[PDB]
């Protein structure tokens, strides 16, 4: 034996946070659906980050390929690696951008991505523990899954904003320097 | 919120293992009650090991001064330090012993103490965790407290045997070499 289901209250709070997460995920799907991700690794990395975040939130609902805390920790580290790669590419977009306010916006969103990848790493431990409290041995940390989902939602939101700001910064470069700029855009935005 | 009581089944299995532990602890109390522990640090260390094991088993019943897993881990490390000190002293008793079979017995019980201190260190983590199993997020490891109590019971039993074998080895030294042996017994066994 040795196992028990989460209290029904906790299962309810989880399905509630997962719904909020799914609404942020829809924003990313809508944004990414416009573009052909050939020649745009920011889109590819965003889709990969999104897919892994879906695995992590599915874990909290008893779904998907992640079975234990170790898998969830490894998923968070993969998200962080992808965010590190998106960061390097979007930094080059921002450097190429001729508008200082679009550039600053984009760089600030990248710092948000770094912070939220780190916070997702922290929450991926989904810690439970026993403690001696109130004259009983109790199991604490049962709401850790909810912190995980909210950290995923925060990261999803920053990825959405970063993808949009990368597009905006790209169009400023082309508007100013033309489609005939000698240096090609770091990333291309072609419709689907 | 965030916390829940252990399933009543688990609370029952814990009170059952604690009872078995208490019977081994009684054997130590009976053995230690005979002796004045002045001049006998094997007795002192055994009492200290016993007292800390009582704190650890009390933790599983919602009693005593240990409140969280970190306290229980620290308690196990204190037990291991005391066992290391008892080991050095009882080794000197065994070295002084003129009967090779009592000496071997005693040294073998000391290796049992080392093994059971190590196993108690492992069990003191009393690990809980969530996992994605059977289409649900469940809490596993709720029987970890039972492994902790049994590891304490194993160590208690080896301490009882070690105290007895230290006494036996001491009396062989005095029987053979007399109360006028030029080298005094490593440890003294005086009645109370």
Residue numbers in the entry:
A (entry chain A), B (entry chain A): 670 to 861
Extract from the study:
The cadherin-catenin cell adhesion complex is the major building block of AJs, and has a crucial function in the dynamic behaviors of epithelial cells, such as cell polarization and cell rearrangements. The structure of α-catenin (100 kDa) consists of three distinct domains. The C-terminal actin-binding domain (ABD) (28 kDa), which is connected to the rest by a flexible P-linker region28 (2 kDa), directly binds to F-actin, and closely resembles the vinculin ABD (vin-ABD). The direct interaction between α-catenin and F-actin was demonstrated to be a catch bond, an interaction that is stabilized by increased force.
To assess whether the α1-helix affects the α-catenin-F-actin interaction, we performed in vitro actin cosedimentation assays with three ABD variants of αE- and αN-catenin (αE-catenin residue numbers are shown): a wild type form of ABD (ABD-WT; residues 652-906), an ABD with a structure-guided helix-1 mutation (H1) designed to unfold α1-helix (ABD-H1; RAIM670-673GSGS), and an ABD with a partially deleted α1-helix (ABD-Δα1; residues 671-906). We observed a nearly two-fold increase in the cosedimented amount of either ABD-H1 or ABD-Δα1 compared to ABD-WT. To examine the structural details of αcat-ABD with enhanced F-actin binding, we determined crystal structures of αNcat-ABD-H1. However, unlike the monomeric αNcat-ABD-WT structure, αNcat-ABD-H1 crystallized as a homodimer connected by two βH motifs. The dimer interface involves L807N of the βH, which mimics M673N of α1-helix interacting with the hydrophobic patch in the αNcat-ABD-WT structure. Moreover, the observation of αNcat-ABD-H1 dimerization, which occludes 3100 Å2 of solvent-accessible surface, in two distinct crystal forms provides a basis for further examining the physiological relevance of this ABD-dimer interface. In addition, we performed chemical shift (CS)-based Rosetta comparative modeling (CM)48 to show that V796N of αNcat-ABD-WT remained in the cryptic state, whereas αNcat-ABD-H1 displayed a large conformational change that exposed V796N on the surface, resembling V796 in the crystal structure of αEcat-ABD-WT. It involves the βH motif forming an extensive dimer interface with the hydrophobic patch uncovered by α1-helix unfolding.
